[PDB]
Write an enzyme that holds these catalytic residues in place. Structure first.
Site, short mmCIF file in Angstrom:
data_model
loop_
_atom_site.label_atom_id
_atom_site.label_comp_id
_atom_site.label_asym_id
_atom_site.label_seq_id
_atom_site.Cartn_x
_atom_site.Cartn_y
_atom_site.Cartn_z
N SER A 1 5.83 3.09 2.49
CA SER A 1 6.20 1.83 3.11
C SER A 1 6.54 0.83 2.03
CB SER A 1 5.06 1.31 3.97
OG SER A 1 4.02 0.86 3.14
N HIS B 1 1.27 -4.78 6.07
CA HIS B 1 0.12 -3.91 6.29
C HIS B 1 -0.37 -3.29 5.01
CE1 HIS B 1 3.01 -0.41 6.75
NE2 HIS B 1 2.02 0.27 6.19
N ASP C 1 6.05 -7.26 9.96
CA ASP C 1 5.31 -6.48 8.96
C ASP C 1 5.93 -6.66 7.59
OD1 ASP C 1 3.32 -4.82 7.82
OD2 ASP C 1 4.34 -2.94 8.54
N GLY D 1 2.34 6.38 1.98
CA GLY D 1 2.41 5.59 0.77
C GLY D 1 3.82 5.20 0.33
C1 LIG Z 1 -2.26 -5.62 9.34
O1 LIG Z 1 -1.10 -6.35 9.70
C2 LIG Z 1 -0.08 -5.57 10.22
C3 LIG Z 1 1.23 -6.19 10.67
C4 LIG Z 1 2.35 -5.36 11.26
C5 LIG Z 1 2.15 -3.81 11.33
N1 LIG Z 1 3.21 -2.97 11.86
C6 LIG Z 1 3.03 -1.52 11.89
C7 LIG Z 1 4.13 -0.65 12.48
C8 LIG Z 1 1.71 -0.93 11.44
O2 LIG Z 1 1.54 0.46 11.52
C9 LIG Z 1 0.41 0.92 10.72
C10 LIG Z 1 0.74 0.93 9.19
C11 LIG Z 1 2.00 1.83 9.29
C12 LIG Z 1 2.26 2.92 8.20
O3 LIG Z 1 1.48 3.81 8.07
N2 LIG Z 1 3.47 2.84 7.39
C13 LIG Z 1 3.81 3.97 6.53
C14 LIG Z 1 3.12 4.06 5.18
O4 LIG Z 1 3.43 4.84 4.33
N3 LIG Z 1 2.05 3.12 5.00
S1 LIG Z 1 1.26 3.15 3.49
O5 LIG Z 1 2.25 2.91 2.40
O6 LIG Z 1 0.67 4.47 3.28
C15 LIG Z 1 -0.04 1.89 3.55
C16 LIG Z 1 -1.04 1.96 4.70
C17 LIG Z 1 0.37 0.49 3.10
C18 LIG Z 1 -0.50 1.38 2.19
C19 LIG Z 1 5.22 4.46 6.13
C20 LIG Z 1 4.35 5.31 7.02
C21 LIG Z 1 4.10 6.79 6.60
C22 LIG Z 1 3.26 7.64 7.24
C23 LIG Z 1 2.48 7.16 8.49
C24 LIG Z 1 1.15 7.96 8.66
C25 LIG Z 1 0.45 7.72 10.04
C26 LIG Z 1 0.52 6.21 10.50
C27 LIG Z 1 1.62 6.15 11.62
C28 LIG Z 1 1.99 4.71 12.05
N4 LIG Z 1 2.99 4.87 13.07
C29 LIG Z 1 3.54 3.74 13.80
O7 LIG Z 1 2.95 2.72 13.82
O8 LIG Z 1 4.81 3.93 14.41
C30 LIG Z 1 5.36 2.82 15.12
C31 LIG Z 1 4.69 2.88 16.66
C32 LIG Z 1 5.67 3.35 17.50
C33 LIG Z 1 7.01 2.98 16.81
C34 LIG Z 1 6.66 2.98 15.21
F1 LIG Z 1 7.32 1.94 14.58
C35 LIG Z 1 2.54 3.91 10.86
O9 LIG Z 1 3.54 4.33 10.37
N5 LIG Z 1 1.78 2.66 10.39
C36 LIG Z 1 0.37 2.19 11.12
N6 LIG Z 1 0.64 -1.75 10.91
C37 LIG Z 1 0.87 -3.20 10.86
C38 LIG Z 1 -0.24 -4.06 10.26
#
Ligand SMILES: COc1ccc2nc(C)c(O[C@@H]3C[C@H]4C(=O)N[C@]5(C(=O)NS(=O)(=O)C6(C)CC6)C[C@H]5/C=C\CCCCC[C@H](NC(=O)O[C@@H]5CCC[C@H]5F)C(=O)N4C3)nc2c1
Ligand SMILES: [Zn+2]
EC number: 3.4.22.-
Length: 197
Positions: A159, A77, A101, A157
Site C-alpha cells: 500500500s 491506514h 485512506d 506491505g
Molecule cells: C485506520 O484508518 C483507515 C482509513 C481508511 C481505510 N481504507 C481501507 C480500504 C482499509 O483496509 C484495511 C487496510 C488495507 C490493506 O491491507 N492494504 C494493503 C496493504 O498492503 N496494507 S499494508 O501495506 O500491508 C499496511 C497494513 C499499511 C501497513 C495493500 C493490501 C495488500 C494485501 C491485503 C491483505 C488483507 C487485507 C485486505 C483488505 N481488503 C479491503 O479492504 O478491500 C476493500 C473492501 C472491499 C473493496 C476493497 F477496497 C485491505 O486491503 N486493507 C484492510 N483500512 C483503512 C484504515
C-alpha cells in the site's frame, strides 16, 4: 507521574526505495531496523532521499510512499497522522484524508515526482515493495483486476505504492486488495486525480 510518562508516537521513516530509473525495477534498503527505530523517535533523517517510490516504516508497520505533484503520498491506514523524519526533524503532514485512506507530506528534497497519467489507459502496472511489476486491468475509476492471480502475501506491505500506465505515469496509489481463498483477485487504488495539493 502519569503525564510525565506519556510518550509521543514516532515518525514515519524512509528505510528504502523502489528504483524505477532504468530497465529493471529493484528494491534498495537504505536503513536497517535499529536505525529505523532510532530515526523514528528523533524524526531526524540525514540520509539523502532519491527516486519516486520510497519504502517507509513506522515502529510497527512497513509499506510504500510515492511522490506525485511534489507530495510524498501514502495510506492513512499505514501512516495515520504521523510526521515523517527529515534532515530538519519531524515534518507534519500537509494533507490528511482518512475518507480516501490518504495522507501526504511535502516531497523530501532530492526526490522526484511521477507524472500523473492522462492516457485513460486500462492496462495498469502495480509496483510492489519487492519491486514486482504486476499487470492489472483497470475496472472503472479506482479498481483493478489482476491478470495473473498470485497469493495475497505477494501484495502485503505495498500500500502506498504506485499503479502505473504503460508509459510509466502514475494512475493512483495502491490502497487495498480483494482475495478469494487466499489468492489476490483485485485491487483498489486512490486515483491520481486526488493526489494533488
Ligand atoms: C485506520 O484508518 C483507515 C482509513 C481508511 C481505510 N481504507 C481501507 C480500504 C482499509 O483496509 C484495511 C487496510 C488495507 C490493506 O491491507 N492494504 C494493503 C496493504 O498492503 N496494507 S499494508 O501495506 O500491508 C499496511 C497494513 C499499511 C501497513 C495493500 C493490501 C495488500 C494485501 C491485503 C491483505 C488483507 C487485507 C485486505 C483488505 N481488503 C479491503 O479492504 O478491500 C476493500 C473492501 C472491499 C473493496 C476493497 F477496497 C485491505 O486491503 N486493507 C484492510 N483500512 C483503512 C484504515
Ligand atoms: Zn499514462
Amino acid at each position: 507521574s502519569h503525564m510525565a510518562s506519556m510518550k509521543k508516537k514516532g515518525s514515519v521513516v524512509i528505510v528504502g526505495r523502489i528504483n524505477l530509473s532504468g530497465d529493471t525495477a529493484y528494491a534498495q534498503q537504505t536503513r536497517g531496523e535499529e536505525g529505523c527505530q532510532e530515526t523514528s523517535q528523533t524524526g531526524r533523517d540525514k540520509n539523502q532521499v532519491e527516486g519516486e517510490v520510497q519504502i517507509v516504516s513506522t515502529a510497527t508497520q512497513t509499506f510504500l510512499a510515492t511522490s506525485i505533484n511534489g507530495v510524498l503520498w501514502t495510506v492513512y491506514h499505514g501512516a495515520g497522522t504521523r510526521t515523517i523524519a527529515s534532515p530538519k526533524g519531524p515534518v507534519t503532514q500537509m494533507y490528511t484524508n482518512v475518507d480516501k485512506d490518504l495522507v501526504g507530506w511535502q516531497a523530501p528534497q532530492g526526490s522526484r515526482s511521477l507524472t500523473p497519467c492522462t492516457c485513460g489507459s486500462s492496462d495498469l502496472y502495480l509496483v510492489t515493495r519487492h519491486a514486482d511489476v504486476i499487470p492489472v486491468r483497470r475496472r472503472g475509476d479506482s479498481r483493478g483486476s489482476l491478470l495473473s492471480p498470485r497469493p495475497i502475501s505477494y501484495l502485503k506491505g505495498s500500500s502506498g505504492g504506485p499503479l502505473l500506465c504503460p508509459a510509466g505515469h502514475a494512475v493512483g496509489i495502491f490502497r487495498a486488495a480483494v482475495s478469494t481463498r487466499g489468492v489476490a483477485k483485485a485491487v483498489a487504488f486512490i486515483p491520481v486525480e486526488s493526489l494533488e495539493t
